[PDB]
């Protein structure tokens, strides 16, 4: 980025039961915009198949991840925070890079 993007961020909470992390997100964007909506992307590390979703339209590429959150919760102002979350099946492993990367713009985690 030859310029300056945003630098919002996003925490993780997980919550595995047998096998089955689900992963309770909350966005957190502090740059300087209206989030009216957005897609951020990265990678899982480990194996985290993701597969049920809600409030985030998660789309896992082979192994890569993006997630375009919807206008409705995704409404959230450049103070603001925002949320989704999901449930993929994982093995024993690291879970959650560091700095994801919303539709452009760099995201460290929290």
């Known amino acids: 980025a030859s310029s300056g993007p945003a630098g919002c961020q996003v925490l993780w909470g997980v919550n595995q039961w047998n096998t089955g992390f689900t992963a309770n997100v909350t966005v957190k964007n502090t740059s300087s915009a209206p989030v009216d909506g957005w897609t951020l992307t990265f990678s899982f590390p480990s194996g985290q198949q993701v597969t049920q979703a809600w409030s985030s339209t998660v789309t896992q590429s082979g192994s890569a991840v993006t997630v375009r959150n919807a206008p409705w919760n995704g409404s959230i102002p450049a103070g603001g925070t925002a949320q989704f979350g999901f449930n993929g099946s994982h093995t ?14 760099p995201c460290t985690v929290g």
């Open 92 to 105: 024993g492993t690291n879970a959650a890079p560091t700095a994801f990367s919303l539709n452009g713009t």
